[PDB]
Amino acid sequence: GPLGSYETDHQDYCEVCQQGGEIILCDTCPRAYHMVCLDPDMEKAPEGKWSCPHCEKEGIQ
Ligand SMILES: [Zn+2]
Ligand SMILES: [Zn+2]
């Protein structure tokens, strides 16, 4: 499912469940996975700019 406007083009299936549907597409990364496979604690809906939880891990923090 499309998030709307994302930077990079990416798959329409979960890399975790290996199935699409209500997956979330990082607005920056070529990643695609459902919210539940990312984090059951993640409840904040992807509104427009949604960057994957992996994004913060790709930073030099
Ligand atoms: Zn999934
Ligand atoms: Zn990302």
Q: What is the 3-state secondary structure (H, E, C) of 6-38?
A: CCCCCCCCCCCCCCCCCEEECCCCCCEEEHHHH
Long-range contacts of 22-28 (CB under 8 A, 24+ apart): 24/50, 24/52, 25/50, 26/50, 26/51, 26/52, 26/54, 26/55, 27/3, 27/51, 28/52, 28/55
If you measure from the C-alpha of residue 10 to the centroid of ligand 2, how many angstroms do you get, rounded to a whole number?
11
| Beta-carbon neighbours within 5 Å of ion ligand 2 | 26, 28-29, 51-52, 55
Class of domain 1-61: alpha beta
Cα–Cα distance for residue pair 53/41, rounded to 1 Å = 12
If you measure from the C-alpha of residue 30 to the centroid of ligand 2, how many angstroms do you get, rounded to a whole number?
8
> Which ligand is the nearest neighbour of the Cα of 24?
1
Residue type for position 34: H
The ranges assigned to domains in the chain are 1-61
> Which ligand is the nearest neighbour of the Cα of 39?
1
Q: How was this structure determined?
A: NMR
Cα–Cα distance for residue pair 46/50, rounded to 1 Å = 5
| Cross-strand bridge partners of residue 25 | 32
